[PDB]
Structures are given as structure tokens and as C-alpha cells.
Amino acid sequence: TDICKLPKDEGTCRDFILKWYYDPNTKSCARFWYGGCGGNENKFGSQKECEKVCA
């Protein structure tokens, strides 16, 4: 899904939560801090879910 190729988007706001995004260059998911606003769909709550959908 093109969703998995969207770039990492930390967004804005200050309700910081650790999320996971898929990195097509390493073909694996990595952690990132999301502020709570203005992100995109390449964002998952767990490494396992991110891997299932995008790996």
C-alpha cells in the first residue's frame, strides 16, 4: 500500500506518543515520536502491527 511509503511525519502539538512507521529503505519499522496533530497514515501503535501491514 502506498500508505507504507509515506515519509515519517512527527506532526505537531504536544500530546507525544511513541509510534512506529515503516521505512521502505530498510524494509522494516522504526519508532518515532508523534505530537498528536498533522501526521499521516504511516503510523502504527506497535511494531508487530506495522510489520504485518507493511513488511
Report all structural domains of the chain as residue ranges with CATH numbers, in order of start: 1-55 (4.10.410.10)
| Deposited resolution, Å | 1.6
Give the cell for residue 21: 512507521
Contact 21, 43 (CB under 8 A): yes
Cell 496533530 belongs to residue: 37
Residue 34 pairs in a beta bridge with: 17
Experiment used for this model: X-ray
17-41 as b/e: b if 16+ CB within 10 A:
eebbbbbeeeeebeebebeeeebee
